Amino acid sequence: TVTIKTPDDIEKMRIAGRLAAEVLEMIGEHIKPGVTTEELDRICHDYIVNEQKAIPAPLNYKGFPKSICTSINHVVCHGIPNEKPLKEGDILNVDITVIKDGYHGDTSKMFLVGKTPEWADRLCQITQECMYKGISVVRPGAHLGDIGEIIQKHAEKNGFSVVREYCGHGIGKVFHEEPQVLHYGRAGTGIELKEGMIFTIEPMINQGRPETRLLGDGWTAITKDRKLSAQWEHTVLVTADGYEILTLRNDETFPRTS
Amino acid sequence: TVTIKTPDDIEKMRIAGRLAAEVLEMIGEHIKPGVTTEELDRICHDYIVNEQKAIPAPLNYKGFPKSICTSINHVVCHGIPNEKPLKEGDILNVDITVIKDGYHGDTSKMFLVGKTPEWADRLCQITQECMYKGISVVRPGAHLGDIGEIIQKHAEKNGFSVVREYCGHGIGKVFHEEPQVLHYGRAGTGIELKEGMIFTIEPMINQGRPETRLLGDGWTAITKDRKLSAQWEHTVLVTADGYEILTLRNDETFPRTS
Amino acid sequence: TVTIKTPDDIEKMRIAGRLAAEVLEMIGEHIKPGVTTEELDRICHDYIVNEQKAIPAPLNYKGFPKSICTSINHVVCHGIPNEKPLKEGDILNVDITVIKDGYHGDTSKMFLVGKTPEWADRLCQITQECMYKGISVVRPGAHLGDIGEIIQKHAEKNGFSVVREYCGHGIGKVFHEEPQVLHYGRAGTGIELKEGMIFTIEPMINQGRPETRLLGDGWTAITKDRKLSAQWEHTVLVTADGYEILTLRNDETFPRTSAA
Amino acid sequence: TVTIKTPDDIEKMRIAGRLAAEVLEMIGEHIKPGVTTEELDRICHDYIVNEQKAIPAPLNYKGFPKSICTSINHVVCHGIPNEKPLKEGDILNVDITVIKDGYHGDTSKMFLVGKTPEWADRLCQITQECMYKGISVVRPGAHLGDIGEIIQKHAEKNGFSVVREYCGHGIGKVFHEEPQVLHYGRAGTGIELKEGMIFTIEPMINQGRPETRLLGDGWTAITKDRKLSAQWEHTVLVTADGYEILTLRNDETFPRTS
Ligand SMILES: [Mn+2]
Ligand SMILES: [Mn+2]
Ligand SMILES: [Mn+2]
Ligand SMILES: [Mn+2]
Ligand SMILES: [Mn+2]
Ligand SMILES: [Mn+2]
Ligand SMILES: [Mn+2]
Ligand SMILES: [Mn+2]
Ligand SMILES: [Mn+2]
Ligand SMILES: [Mn+2]
Ligand SMILES: [Mn+2]
Ligand SMILES: [Mn+2]
Ligand SMILES: [Mn+2]
Ligand SMILES: [Mn+2]
């Protein structure tokens, strides 16, 4: 079965989700042509440990060797920071998880590096709209299948496709727990939602076809046709009559609660 | 089916809605202990016909004998103006409808008469909160059961009950048209909302049990237990992204559109 | 404000269910030691045809020979009225269905004949409590499996067993239609309930073991172990927020609706 | 205002009254288990038209379809003759009205079918005693309330009740005229009686509670509790010295006149 959180559990989860949003607000100033992805990893690690008094959750998790994930261009997810510099025309995803006194918060966003193609800015805008529509249907008595149907309809109207081989997850005292959150599907299918459940919504959307391929290093996933791919993520709580977003930033204009 | 209004129809419904709101702003200055409900009906009739250049919709409609409805304490709806004085401690509903060049606007509010008891004040507060929550869920793709469920949950968790045999309604070039609007129910059920539809939200909430009965005159309804009952009403348009309230007053702080 | 409206088919099903409940209210005054089950059939038939201006649905249905069903002691369901008298200590089920201008109403209850023993009284009481728990979970968005789970848990923690090979049914302008309503199972399984659906809740519960067998007339079912069995039945409507009982009597204290 | 009959109208009322009593004397030998109420209707019709040279007043009167009324067990009044046989143990009322050259006579009695239970025999006897006590108070100077008080007191001492919704009537050249004759009330109330008035006394008495219910055919009335009901009827003239009974049978022992 899925876990139900207490009123005291809910207060410690609000503190961890605010600190994860603050790392994304700090890192923006440092993104330009010429800076390396291993330079960005060192800056985020020192801020989390020395200034917030917390720990980066990816470090040593099932053998992962760094503190954050960094994914550029045709890469879908799980990219490893290294010594290559950022170039004029690149699109970039930064993905963060923090632990504070045993509790987890999980979130990601897109950056545009100088002059980009018009196709590329539009792919990134339509991906963010898809995540906001999926959050809008969450409440007691809805089903998990209602999330997948609304995301899949908005992507296909714009000529793009939905990745099937990766998904969202429950979260709390551990990094990954039940249920599996699919980003495609039919309304009315899957488990019924209840007050006190906590889970992520994290859609991956491709320019061409849906299939992926894994690289040599055992971690890095790319598109099979070599076209572009975009992602955004938030942590979400089910309340008495709707939703609350735990990881909301100062620069966003969508409302925190229903 | 359900009628869909044109751009010219909408402009004329905005003029009728503003006039009905001004009748309520005007009469609040005349209400205090000692005044009769028949004197209040005379003041409202003269304002509508001689200053606005319009007509009162209740007058002679299926035999009804007056131009407004006035309901006190244990009365639920449809009270007839008469020769009795208002008293220190009473609670009062005034319900208005105006016709201007063929088009209808409909709205009602609660007034406190001199010094009132704390348990009467709490009932009037919770009922106005119920109405505003039902308005906040309206947009294209929502369903009518969404309105019923959010109203019923807010009343019952605070210890109050919902009136079952009276409802809200469609409105335009006629007073009463399709659909029926219930104040109780389950989310995602009933017909689906579209741009250009117009209807009323008007909940009746009780201090004690939900049952009602009709008196000897054929018109006045009361609570079967003789405890208190309260009501508030607005006229509402579905827009391209949300709602617009056509009967909003300058004394209110809640926003006009989404 | 304006008064709510009600579709014509629902007004006609409310009339048929009030008539079937009135048949059970009338017949209780005639039940006592020495009266035969064929004499109860003749009294019921005359009331429905001459006073109500209606018809008995069991008569001639797939060949059945009488107007009502009468089921005694170790008999489980579908017994035929005959020339044998009732005796002191007996338990009795009387099962009724009425048709009024094409529309159907379906209901049954238990009667205690003279002084009865303590172990018979306890079985009849727990069977009534099972039926009422099953009606309590009905609303838009519940599943057919939630009805079977709550009935099966209440019977088994009190020491009794559930009959598996007979079920409740859909009803309206016809006697028997989809869905099948099982009295055992697991919560969240089977079809979802919707506003406007109409069906029966009718559990059979046994003193000992659950297995049954059919006698040679092709109709009468009995317990395999020869110990006692009991049943109660109502017709139920799904409303916009919960349930309505169409066949309620003036003698019951459970509420007609959710509201209450 | 009540009509007063002349000496010539009085001699013609005596002839019609003796004929209606002769119908009741004839029919008694045909009543036993297994005969139908429509067979009894045919025998009465033929005797009145072919042997008396007269007409049955109920036939086609305001829609009524038969020549006599036949009421059994829990039925109170107005039963329609039909194809159902009489059963051993029943109680039965036969009600007759004849017209002879324009003048009306009206009377009824109770019959026991085969062997009967002893406390049904008792209800039929106490009902006959009630009728005879009301005839006994009639003379010039009495009041109509004296009739109702004496009837009600006898029935309630014996544990029975009086039907309120049906009553006795004026009679003459028309079937139903003024005054209304109630079978409950207080001594010394209502109109004062005068020589030359003619009216009926016809009490209905129940085993349990007094309330009644109407069947679907629109004519047949029953007890609300389903217990037994009985009735007896005579036509009565006010004379100079006291009373005269116009419908007396050859088998009765009560005195014809004062
Ligand atoms: Mn995640
Ligand atoms: Mn993540
Ligand atoms: Mn479901
Ligand atoms: Mn990418
Ligand atoms: Mn009130
Ligand atoms: Mn109104
Ligand atoms: Mn929909
Ligand atoms: Mn209205
Ligand atoms: Mn049945
Ligand atoms: Mn059945
Ligand atoms: Mn049995
Ligand atoms: Mn008569
Ligand atoms: Mn008469
Ligand atoms: Mn009778």
XYZ file of N, CA, C and O in Angstrom, chain A residues 189-242:
216
model
N -8.428 4.996 -15.168
C -7.561 3.868 -14.806
C -6.584 4.135 -13.636
O -6.231 5.295 -13.374
N -6.127 3.076 -12.956
C -5.186 3.147 -11.815
C -5.757 3.398 -10.419
O -6.989 3.416 -10.294
N -4.900 3.630 -9.405
C -5.306 3.785 -7.991
C -6.048 5.095 -7.676
O -5.781 6.108 -8.360
N -6.969 5.075 -6.692
C -7.710 6.271 -6.185
C -6.872 7.128 -5.210
O -6.279 6.523 -4.298
N -6.809 8.464 -5.355
C -6.080 9.405 -4.432
C -6.758 9.761 -3.073
O -7.983 9.928 -3.055
N -5.990 9.869 -1.966
C -6.454 10.145 -0.586
C -5.657 11.288 0.059
O -4.441 11.367 -0.238
N -6.299 12.138 0.882
C -5.665 13.196 1.717
C -4.436 12.711 2.522
O -4.488 11.629 3.147
N -3.323 13.467 2.452
C -2.015 13.072 3.042
C -0.939 12.315 2.244
O 0.162 12.123 2.797
N -1.226 11.864 1.011
C -0.264 11.229 0.068
C 0.717 12.328 -0.511
O 0.255 13.480 -0.760
N 1.999 11.994 -0.763
C 3.028 12.928 -1.376
C 3.816 12.214 -2.518
O 4.313 11.089 -2.281
N 3.916 12.796 -3.745
C 4.534 12.157 -4.960
C 5.106 13.228 -5.961
O 4.800 14.407 -5.772
N 6.021 12.887 -6.891
C 6.536 13.853 -7.905
C 5.757 13.796 -9.261
O 5.232 12.697 -9.667
N 5.713 14.921 -9.998
C 5.287 14.984 -11.434
C 6.500 15.567 -12.257
O 6.931 16.691 -11.995
N 7.085 14.783 -13.176
C 8.381 15.059 -13.868
C 8.426 14.697 -15.407
O 9.306 13.928 -15.823
N 7.492 15.227 -16.257
C 7.417 14.795 -17.679
C 8.677 15.079 -18.548
O 9.204 16.212 -18.467
N 9.134 14.075 -19.316
C 10.110 14.170 -20.451
C 9.424 14.167 -21.850
O 8.712 13.195 -22.201
N 9.668 15.195 -22.671
C 8.943 15.421 -23.964
C 9.951 15.552 -25.151
O 10.878 16.396 -25.103
N 9.812 14.765 -26.230
C 10.767 14.758 -27.409
C 10.273 15.457 -28.718
O 9.090 15.358 -29.070
N 11.120 16.182 -29.448
C 10.828 16.778 -30.779
C 10.332 15.773 -31.856
O 9.365 16.101 -32.576
N 10.984 14.594 -31.973
C 10.647 13.519 -32.971
C 9.916 12.311 -32.391
O 8.871 12.509 -31.751
N 10.415 11.075 -32.569
C 9.799 9.819 -32.006
C 10.122 9.517 -30.499
O 11.074 10.135 -29.978
N 9.378 8.597 -29.802
C 9.533 8.342 -28.341
C 10.671 7.432 -27.839
O 11.096 7.547 -26.663
N 11.215 6.561 -28.697
C 12.243 5.603 -28.230
C 13.597 6.227 -27.726
O 14.028 7.248 -28.278
N 14.182 5.665 -26.660
C 15.519 5.968 -26.064
C 16.582 4.849 -26.171
O 16.226 3.697 -26.468
N 17.861 5.168 -25.917
C 19.046 4.263 -25.943
C 20.036 4.570 -24.800
O 20.269 5.752 -24.551
N 20.688 3.582 -24.159
C 21.651 3.805 -23.043
C 23.137 3.837 -23.441
O 23.553 3.013 -24.247
N 23.956 4.740 -22.894
C 25.363 4.777 -23.293
C 26.246 3.822 -22.490
O 25.824 3.265 -21.455
N 27.489 3.719 -22.953
C 28.577 3.010 -22.275
C 28.752 3.135 -20.770
O 28.875 2.125 -20.077
N 28.754 4.354 -20.238
C 28.977 4.584 -18.813
C 27.946 3.949 -17.856
O 28.068 4.064 -16.628
N 26.934 3.282 -18.413
C 25.811 2.696 -17.664
C 24.717 3.604 -17.106
O 23.810 3.096 -16.431
N 24.805 4.926 -17.326
C 23.883 5.912 -16.712
C 23.154 6.838 -17.733
O 21.951 7.064 -17.611
N 23.885 7.398 -18.703
C 23.400 8.421 -19.664
C 22.418 7.867 -20.751
O 22.820 7.058 -21.613
N 21.150 8.323 -20.745
C 20.115 8.002 -21.763
C 19.952 9.092 -22.848
O 19.813 10.253 -22.436
N 19.942 8.767 -24.167
C 19.799 9.748 -25.302
C 18.529 9.439 -26.167
O 17.997 8.293 -26.129
N 18.034 10.388 -26.980
C 17.081 10.013 -28.055
C 17.665 9.092 -29.159
O 18.792 9.318 -29.630
N 16.911 8.079 -29.605
C 17.368 7.166 -30.662
C 17.496 7.851 -32.036
O 18.474 7.598 -32.770
N 16.570 8.753 -32.384
C 16.726 9.570 -33.615
C 17.621 10.853 -33.533
O 17.713 11.580 -34.556
N 18.302 11.121 -32.398
C 19.230 12.302 -32.214
C 18.604 13.728 -32.268
O 19.334 14.763 -32.277
N 17.267 13.819 -32.275
C 16.564 15.117 -32.070
C 16.536 15.629 -30.595
O 16.898 14.863 -29.649
N 16.113 16.890 -30.371
C 16.082 17.465 -28.973
C 15.055 16.884 -27.944
O 13.960 16.452 -28.372
N 15.332 16.962 -26.618
C 14.459 16.499 -25.475
C 14.436 17.513 -24.243
O 15.533 17.996 -23.858
N 13.270 17.874 -23.668
C 13.108 18.783 -22.492
C 12.319 18.191 -21.260
O 11.463 17.279 -21.455
N 12.720 18.584 -20.042
C 12.095 18.185 -18.699
C 11.878 19.353 -17.639
O 12.706 20.308 -17.532
N 10.772 19.361 -16.869
C 10.610 20.158 -15.628
C 9.987 19.259 -14.491
O 9.198 18.350 -14.833
N 10.283 19.497 -13.204
C 9.778 18.676 -12.009
C 9.333 19.483 -10.740
O 10.029 20.437 -10.384
N 8.259 19.094 -10.011
C 7.903 19.652 -8.655
C 7.516 18.524 -7.622
O 7.101 17.452 -8.066
N 7.616 18.726 -6.294
C 7.072 17.797 -5.224
C 5.645 18.250 -4.800
O 5.504 19.446 -4.511
N 4.621 17.375 -4.753
C 3.187 17.733 -4.639
C 2.429 17.027 -3.437
O 2.494 15.786 -3.331
N 1.705 17.762 -2.582
C 0.885 17.171 -1.442
C -0.650 17.172 -1.772
O -1.098 18.159 -2.383
N -1.420 16.112 -1.445
C -2.917 16.004 -1.608
C -3.579 16.534 -0.307
O -3.399 15.963 0.788
N -4.271 17.668 -0.399
C -5.016 18.286 0.724
C -6.524 17.925 0.829
O -7.022 17.169 0.009
N -7.264 18.496 1.787
C -8.707 18.202 1.960
C -9.581 18.529 0.749
O -10.510 17.771 0.421
N -9.284 19.621 0.044
C -10.050 19.834 -1.175
C -9.292 20.040 -2.493
O -9.933 20.409 -3.488
N -7.997 19.696 -2.537
C -7.194 19.945 -3.745
C -5.701 19.616 -3.632
O -5.398 18.467 -3.274
